[PDB]
Design a protein around this ligand. Structure first.
Ligand SMILES: [Zn+2]
Ligand SMILES: [Zn+2]
Lengths: 68, 98, 44, 337, 342, 48, 101, 304, 49, 40, 24
């Protein structure tokens, strides 16, 4: 649903570099490729994961049955 | 509808369309016109079931009634046949066959 | 305290043949919350 | 889990398909190895599956209300001495606790029948358990004492050997083995393939377009790009095989997308640096019966004695008019008997 | 093996055959009864001499343990003294089972298979070569499984209508059991002149498929072939591999098979002087040529069938199974791709 | 025509001598086929 | 000591011993590959190799044939042990370079 | 052949060493054995992971089983040599003690922050503890633990592993059981962020390639891969340990006959990452010893 | 069926014929005349179906 | 030795060798041909 | 017809095992 924990093909942790990736494409305006680089995603598999995330969770969070 | 293109390189929209008329075919024909032989088989079996080869080499029904006096007119099995006349591959391996 | 309105989100409790409804909205739509309970799960 | 396809169809963004994902960029294996992947079948890495590969969930919703009529059907517990062991799978209000595990037979709801003086229960009747999610109960238009209620049920559907999977290229294949990540052939680069599809599912299929997606996907990721794949952007001149085959060369990998590989078991480089890449794959819904159903012995019939259909009631398997013949043919009067 | 059928755990434990209790089996049926209905191998119930059933259901060690040793008890009733008890054992690999896939059109769509248990499977498992019969496909397709219920039945399903008893169809006289996909592509690749092997590999492959504790030993010792290439490097060719398999299998009393056949690969693609179009078996040896769908598929006068007439269905049918492993083996060691270059 | 053919048997007082396979399947008698064309006998000694 | 960890399949084993096959549980190619290569370094092993009857049952089959000096048993040992006697050497050569780096 | 003729000749070099990984080569060994080492360092070297996880309550969006599955993946920084295994014969109360397992929980309630810069999108200032990280994972020591793991507390290797998200009113709390195990089971145990080797390519040029054919052949491979000679002008190999096996050279015709890409079947280029639990050199030690042991266990088993 | 309950008795031939009022009124265990089947509590009505 | 065994219900067997191939005649390539021609 | 335009700045994003990126 949200950032997958480890990688899919090696296990290398990945669920962390989400918040920094966004900050890389946002503040530093780096491209998709170089941002995935300095973030520690070398093999494509790992890169894959992040490059194509869908933080769709935040789409749900707007349906909180605990408020007006 | 001639294909001046190929699957590797790329076919054109014109070609592609006509192509659809084609792949839809074999699927409009084997699907819109499915008539099962569920009767054909039962038509035969259920009448010919009891037909068999007795111990006298004759081919009768179950009630004794006779249909033939021998299977193929020679009474040969349809499977023990394969190399019954492969005389070549026969005299080869003779000693094995025998 | 075992219930919550699905509309106005006001936590409430029903009695014996009480108003099958929110005592605030009147939106006769309801849901019971999750009570601090336990289930057995493993990471697989 | 869900992702934006590396190989896109530009018109994807315009139609806004990101707000409603559907696939998952997958690492793909163009190879015959295990030899369990023939007949258009396919192979999934175990360590991926557990790692979370395309894990899905099912949701069923059931309504209760004994309004089959002057009311008499009240939810909760009556004073009569009911069983007791209903006080675990269920709260005191007659509605179950949220996130409770329940399989066929388990209690779902508790109500008193004033004309029956016995507090009874509707149970769960699916050949497979679940955990509770929702708690739906509504009154009528004002007092009309509770009658109508429902709820939702979470049902784990971990990718099991058997469900269907196919990219967007008419490549339907069923899973035959969930191969251990240790027996999988690993790459020069050090990558255990996510999916394995057999090259013998291609010549009589002609779906070259996948082959494209491959190098197409691999690159774009390596460089950080969405590869545009809207129909007819290339023509006989400038062909994908080149355009992308370059991006791969300019990235550092072999031209036609060839990658050196080793046999997880033997451990020596194989023969040809088998060519592989990445594809947007899709998980096909449990569109399978799967549900085997055996039949030692159980339910029959009053007028015939022969067991009746079922699957969920252990129904015997039919020996129809066709198989009747088959046996007849061989000459097995006993097997018939 | 081809003549085999994969048996999923969740089944065998529920399917039971009524075996007569005597001395020869007593050793067994005992043990089983102990293991009860939930541990394979075993049983779920006992029929005494009066016909009454005994569900070892909610039973544990003891109760079973006892009821066990009571297999060889006399008769309280002088009427039924001739009878002995019958244990309802789990279906073991020694048994036979009937497999079928509707619609059953020809007799090949309903055959019998040797039993073999596979722990950890959520579905039946079937060798490929069979696809020709039942008309299989492995794409969401189901089959029926029937269990014999009296020794008279089993007999038929083991010697009249089993698996190999139908190598040739009634329709004309052609095979229905050969190979497919990986197999074809693999086979040949290994048989080309371009295939070379050293001692290590030679032997390794040979055993990786041969299996001596299998059903084909022929001599309690695995034979070998002198290396075609001696010095400087001792090597053996693919074409010898076959020959090696050929000898350790065909009855060690019958002369090696001799055949005159061709494949589906013009002398062309091979290059100048190549005769790899023609296949020449002589004396249980692959002298020249490559092996093709024409050879180990469903093709008359192909080496398979050839073996059939000479050495019978079994020797043959097996050969196949054993190859299907060697083949899938050679593949897992070298692989077979297809890229843009193709 | 299950019903009519039936009338053909009653109105003829026919004797269905349970021969044809179809006729046996109803009664459950072993069929004329192969393993049902011959019989079985026990060569038992001590009878004189 | 354990007993089911290793069993000899008596069927394809002569009476002399220079031919025999064994079934091992709880062990795959990992061991089979390494070991088989070791057995082949014994000048009396005329035949060796390892078979996995099926990947669904953690089984490993080894066949070893000999000329006649030693029988299946021995060969297995000479290798079984020589194995550990080798990986041990690895651990040292690697240890010293870890310590000096 | 002799084990001695082997120890004398066999050799190993260490390329790069680090806390998270290292590079190195094993030379003169056979590919069968190396490979063995492989399957090991991934599937048989123990480590710590979370197995059973009991839900005290969960009212976030992330459904239960999912939640569980997850953390059961999080990397665990605990020397797996400090814990004992688990006997899968004893019932649940005798199966889980102190020196047996490891206990961890996590209790977060989230609420709205009325102090938000009235005009903020970010959920950190609008909401209190909306995001849940791996640093949120709480270690609850049990008896024999308050002294055992007193020096090295338990902490996820990667703290900012984003765990759960939620808006106000939501909460999570549920301790979970955690033991040891290996990759061959459930990859959660795999103590590596992968590790594998690769046969060292051998590039051998047939005839001298001088002149311009030097800069044109040199630029057909990764950098420094092909250095140009001085005076001679002819190229040569610098370090075959830099080749990506692009096979590039084999595209431009002139060279499609001047060389040959091959292998050196005794030279293995090893690289091994790490989840964080066990440092590399270690994960190697165990593996080698792992095989050594598996064997001896056989030397001492009698036959049936 | 079991391998220990055989019987050597078997029908050889089958015939079809009409039922005379005789055989009928003789073999019949009971005559039926009443429409209803059950009383006022759930029991077989005399002469009922 | 290549004879046919007394018993075989060649009848039934033949009904199969007919009904099974008549499934390849689903499509179309003067006279009557295929499925119908058999009806007649 | 415009050719399918290659996006620019294609760099080496791959090297041998156990190697950095600074080699170039
Ligand atoms: Zn990865
Ligand atoms: Zn309300």
């Amino acid at each position: 649903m949200i950032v997958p924990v480890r990688c899919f093909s090696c296990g290398k942790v990945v669920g962390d570099k989400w918040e920094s990736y966004l900050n890389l494409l946002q503040e530093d305006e780096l491209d998709e490729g170089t941002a995935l680089s300095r973030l520690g995603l070398k093999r494509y598999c790992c890169r894959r994961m992040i490059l194509t995330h869908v933080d769709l969770i935040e789409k749900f969070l707007r349906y909180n049955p605990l408020e007006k | 509808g001639y294909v001046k293109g190929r699957f590797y390189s790329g076919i054109k929209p014109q070609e592609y369309y006509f192509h659809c008329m084609a792949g839809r075919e074999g699927l409009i024909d084997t699907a819109v016109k499915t008539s099962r032989s569920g009767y054909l088989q039962r038509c035969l079996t259920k009448q010919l079931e009891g037909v068999h080869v007795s111990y006298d080499n004759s081919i009768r029904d179950a009630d004794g009634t006779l249909v033939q006096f021998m299977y193929g007119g020679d009474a040969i099995d349809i499977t023990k046949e394969s190399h019954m006349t492969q005389f070549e591959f026969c005299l080869d391996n003779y000693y094995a066959l025998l | 305290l075992k219930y919550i309105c699905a509309e106005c989100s006001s936590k409430l409790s029903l009695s014996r043949t009480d108003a099958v409804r929110c005592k605030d909205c009147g939106h006769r739509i309801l849901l019971k919350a999750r009570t601090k309970r336990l289930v057995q799960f493993e990471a697989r | 889990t869900g992702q934006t396809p590396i190989v896109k169809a530009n018109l994807y963004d315009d139609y806004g398909m990101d707000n409603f994902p559907n696939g998952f960029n997958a690492v793909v294996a163009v190879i015959s190895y295990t030899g369990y992947d023939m007949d258009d079948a396919m192979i999934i890495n175990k360590s991926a599956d557990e790692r979370g590969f395309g894990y899905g969930t099912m949701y069923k919703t059931e309504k209760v209300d004994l309004a089959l009529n002057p009311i008499t059907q009240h939810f909760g517990f009556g004073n009569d001495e009911w069983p007791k062991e209903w006080l675990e799978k269920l709260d005191e209000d007659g509605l179950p606790y949220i996130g409770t595990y329940v399989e066929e037979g388990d209690p779902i709801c508790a109500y008193f029948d004033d004309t029956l003086n016995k507090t009874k229960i509707k149970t769960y009747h699916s050949s497979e358990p679940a955990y509770i999610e929702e708690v739906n109960l509504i009154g009528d238009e004002k007092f009309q004492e509770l009658q109508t209620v429902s709820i939702k049920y979470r049902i784990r559907r971990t990718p099991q050997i058997g469900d269907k999977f196919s990219s967007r290229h008419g490549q339907k294949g069923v899973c035959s083995r969930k191969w251990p990540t240790i027996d999988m052939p690993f790459s020069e680069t050090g990558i255990q393939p996510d999916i394995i599809i057999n090259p013998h599912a291609f010549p009589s299929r002609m779906t070259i377009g996948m082959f494209v997606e491959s190098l197409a996907g691999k690159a774009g990721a390596l460089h950080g790009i969405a590869q545009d794949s809207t129909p007819w952007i290339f023509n006989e001149d400038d062909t994908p095989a080149d355009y992308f085959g370059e991006q791969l060369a300019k990235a550092g990998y072999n031209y036609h997308g060839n990658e050196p590989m080793y046999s997880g078991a033997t451990g020596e480089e194989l023969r040809a640096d088998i060519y592989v890449g990445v594809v947007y794959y899709q998980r096909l819904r449990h569109m399978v019966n799967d549900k085997f159903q055996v039949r030692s012995t159980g339910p029959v019939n009053s007028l015939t004695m022969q067991p009746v259909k079922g699957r969920k009631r252990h129904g015997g398997i039919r020996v129809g008019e066709m198989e009747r013949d088959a046996l007849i043919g061989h000459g097995t009067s006993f097997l018939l008997q | 093996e081809t003549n085999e059928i994969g048996v999923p755990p969740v089944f065998a434990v529920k399917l039971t055959y009524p075996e007569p209790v005597t001395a020869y089996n007593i050793a067994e049926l005992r043990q089983a009864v102990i293991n009860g209905p939930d541990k394979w191998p075993g049983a779920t119930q006992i029929q005494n001499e009066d016909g009454s059933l005994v569900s070892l259901i909610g039973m544990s060690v003891e109760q079973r343990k006892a009821l066990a040793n009571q297999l060889l008890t006399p008769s309280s009733n002088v009427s039924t003294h001739t009878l002995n008890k019958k244990v309802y054992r789990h279906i073991k690999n020694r048994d036979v089972v009937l497999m079928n896939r509707q619609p059953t059109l020809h007799k090949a769509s309903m055959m019998g298979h040797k039993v073999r248990v596979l722990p950890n499977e959520k579905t039946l498992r079937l060798h490929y070569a069979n696809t020709g019969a039942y008309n299989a496909d492995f794409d969401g397709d189901e089959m029926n499984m029937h269990f014999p219920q009296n020794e008279n039945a089993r007999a038929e399903a083991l010697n009249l209508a089993n698996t190999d008893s139908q190598y040739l169809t009634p329709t004309s006289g052609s095979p229905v059991r050969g190979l497919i996909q990986d197999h074809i592509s693999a086979g040949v690749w290994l048989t080309s002149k371009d295939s070379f092997f050293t001692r290590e590999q030679y032997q390794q492959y040979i055993y990786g498929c041969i299996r001596p504790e299998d059903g084909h030993t022929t001599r309690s010792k695995i034979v070998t072939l002198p290396p075609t290439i001696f010095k400087p490097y001792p090597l053996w060719t693919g074409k010898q591999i076959i020959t090696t398999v050929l000898l350790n299998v065909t009855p060690p009393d019958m002369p090696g098979i001799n055949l005159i056949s061709k494949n589906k690969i013009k002398n062309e693609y091979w290059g100048k002087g190549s005769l790899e179009n023609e296949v020449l078996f002589k004396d249980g040896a692959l002298l020249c040529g490559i092996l093709d769908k024409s050879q180990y598929g469903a093709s008359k006068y192909g080496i398979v069938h050839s073996l059939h007439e000479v050495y019978g269905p079994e020797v043959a049918a097996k050969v196949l199974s054993v190859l299907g492993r060697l083949f899938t083996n050679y593949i897992t060691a070298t692989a077979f791709t297809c890229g843009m270059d193709d | 025509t299950t019903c009519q053919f039936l009338t053909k048997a009653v109105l003829d007082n026919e004797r269905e001598q349970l021969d044809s396979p179809s006729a046996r399947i109803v009664v459950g008698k072993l069929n004329n086929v192969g393993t049902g064309s011959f019989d079985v006998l026990a060569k038992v000694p001590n009878a004189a | 000591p354990d007993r089911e960890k290793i069993k000899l399949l008596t069927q394809a084993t002569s009476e002399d011993g220079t031919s025999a096959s064994f079934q091992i549980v709880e062990e795959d190619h990992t061991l089979g590959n390494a070991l088989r290569y070791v057995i082949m370094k014994n000048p009396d092993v005329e035949f060796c190799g390892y078979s996995i009857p099926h990947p669904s049952e953690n089984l490993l089959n080894i066949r070893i044939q000999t000329y006649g000096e030693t029988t299946a048993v021995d060969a297995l040992q000479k290798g079984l042990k020589d194995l550990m006697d080798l990986c041990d050497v690895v651990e040292s050569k690697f240890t010293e370079k870890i310590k000096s780096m | 052949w002799n084990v001695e003729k082997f120890k004398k000749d066999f050799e190993v070099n260490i390329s790069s060493l680090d806390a998270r990984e290292a590079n190195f080569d094993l030379i003169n060994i056979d590919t069968s054995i190396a490979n063995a080492f492989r399957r090991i360092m991934i599937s048989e070297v123990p480590s710590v992971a979370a197995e059973y996880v009991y839900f005290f309550n969960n009212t976030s969006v992330i459904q239960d089983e999912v939640l569980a599955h997850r953390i059961g993946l999080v990397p665990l920084k605990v020397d797996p040599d400090m814990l004992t295994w688990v006997d899968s014969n004893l019932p649940d109360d005798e199966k889980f003690t102190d020196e047996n397992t490891i206990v961890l929980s996590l209790n977060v309630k989230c609420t709205r922050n009325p102090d938000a810069p009235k005009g903020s999108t970010d959920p950190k200032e609008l909401y209190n503890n909306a995001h849940v990280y791996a640093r949120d994972l709480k270690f609850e020591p049990q008896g024999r633990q308050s002294t055992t793991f007193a020096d090295c507390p338990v902490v996820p290797a990667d703290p900012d592993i984003l765990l759960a998200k939620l808006r106000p009113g939501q909460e999570i709390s549920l301790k979970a059981h955690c033991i040891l195990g290996i990759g061959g089971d459930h990859a959660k145990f795999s103590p590596v962020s992968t590790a594998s080797y690769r046969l060292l390519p051998q590039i051998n040029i047939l005839q001298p390639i001088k002149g311009e054919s030097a800069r044109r052949f040199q630029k057909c491979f990764p950098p420094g891969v092909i250095g140009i000679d001085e005076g001679s002008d002819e190229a040569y190999v610098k370090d075959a340990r830099k080749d990506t096996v692009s096979r590039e050279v084999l595209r431009y015709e002139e060279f499609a006959d001047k060389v040959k890409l091959g292998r050196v079947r005794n030279h293995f280029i090893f690289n091994v990452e790490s989840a964080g639990a066990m440092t590399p050199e270690e994960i190697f030690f165990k593996s080698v010893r792992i095989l050594k042991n598996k064997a001896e266990y056989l030397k001492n088993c009698p036959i049936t | 069926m079991d391998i220990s309950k055989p019987v050597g008795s078997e029908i050889t031939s089958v015939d079809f014929g009409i039922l005379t009022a005789k055989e009928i009124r003789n073999l019949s265990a009971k005559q039926i005349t009443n429409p209803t089947v059950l009383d006022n509590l759930g029991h077989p009505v005399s002469g009922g179906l | 030795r290549s004879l046919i065994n007394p018993g075989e219900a060649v009848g039934i067997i033949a009904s199969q060798s007919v009904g099974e191939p008549s499934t390849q005649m689903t499509l179309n390539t003067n006279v009557t041909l295929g499925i119908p021609r058999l009806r007649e | 017809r415009k050719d399918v335009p290659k996006v620019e700045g294609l760099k080496l994003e791959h090297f041998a095992t156990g190697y950095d990126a600074e080699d170039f």
